[PDB]
Amino acid sequence: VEDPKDFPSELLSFLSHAVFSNRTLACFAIYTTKEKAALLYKKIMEKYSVTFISRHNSYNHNILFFLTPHRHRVSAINNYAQKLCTFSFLICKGVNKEYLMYSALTRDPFSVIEESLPGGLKEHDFNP
Amino acid sequence: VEDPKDFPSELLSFLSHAVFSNRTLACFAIYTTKEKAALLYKKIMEKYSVTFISRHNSYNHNILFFLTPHRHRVSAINNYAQKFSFLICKGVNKEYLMYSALTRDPFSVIEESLPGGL
């Protein structure tokens, strides 16, 4: 067993795969170890003043999903993540299907561990 | 060709770009077609008791700008507007600059709720 080279297949359809793109987004997701996830959970929340950020169980690892106040290039959300994150796999990408990504993160095979707004988000709150 | 994805780059600075927020505001702006813009001018005026609302010529399309006496979630405004043409609804952070820009070439006003605007 090596480390994931990308997010689980189930989610791939809701994410952008141009991690080098110059496009900017406000929704992001990170695939990394449990311990790092929990740490990036507090860090990212502060760093980008997230409007929402959730941590999810994902096959022995974790997935952070978060919404930002401003727009950024997946490029800079990755540099920051990596910075404080050696010796640990870390996969970062922008989300195109915001609601779909999160909602899927609340259902099997996934499940929430914690989230900035207990209660979670509903589809109509999104302004894609 | 696909419909627009954002407001004209020349205005992005004055706007809020969260696709998810619990922040409420009293100034919004909609980027859609000329016909939809017209419908909405009246509809939006009534629905949110705007204190001021203006509709400007963008290029092929139109941009609607208004201020509210009370605050709402951009999402709530958007949900209302959506109910087939493209439509982009967003909060405005720098209200004056935003309305000012919409009154200069390229842009111009078609109709506003206050003679002279701002």
Swiss-Prot record, chain B:
Phosphorylated on both serine and threonine residues. Small t antigen inhibits the dephosphorylation by the AC form of PP2A. O-Glycosylated near the C-terminal region. Residues 8-118 bind DNA. It comes from the Viruses. It is found in: Host nucleus. The sequence shown is that of strain 776. The J domain is essential for multiple viral activities, including virion assembly, viral DNA replication, transformation and transcriptional activation. The LXCXE motif specifically binds to host pRB, RBL1, and RBL2. Isoform large T antigen is a key early protein essential for both driving viral replication and inducing cellular transformation. Plays a role in viral genome replication by driving entry of quiescent cells into the cell cycle and by autoregulating the synthesis of viral early mRNA. Displays highly oncogenic activities by corrupting the host cellular checkpoint mechanisms that guard cell division and the transcription, replication, and repair of DNA. Participates in the modulation of cellular gene expression preceeding viral DNA replication. Isoform large T antigen forms homohexamers in the presence of ATP. Interacts with host HDAC1. Interacts (via LXCXE domain) with host RB1; the interaction induces the aberrant dissociation of RB1-E2F1 complex thereby disrupting RB1's activity. Interacts (via LXCXE domain) with host pRB-related proteins RBL1 and RBL2. Interacts (via C-terminus) with host TOP1 and POLA1 allowing DNA replication. Interacts with host TP53, inhibiting TP53 binding to DNA. Interacts with host preinitiation complex components TBP, TFIIA and TFIID to regulate transcription initiation. This is Large T antigen. It comes from Simian virus 40. The chain holds residues 132 to 252 of 708 of the full protein.
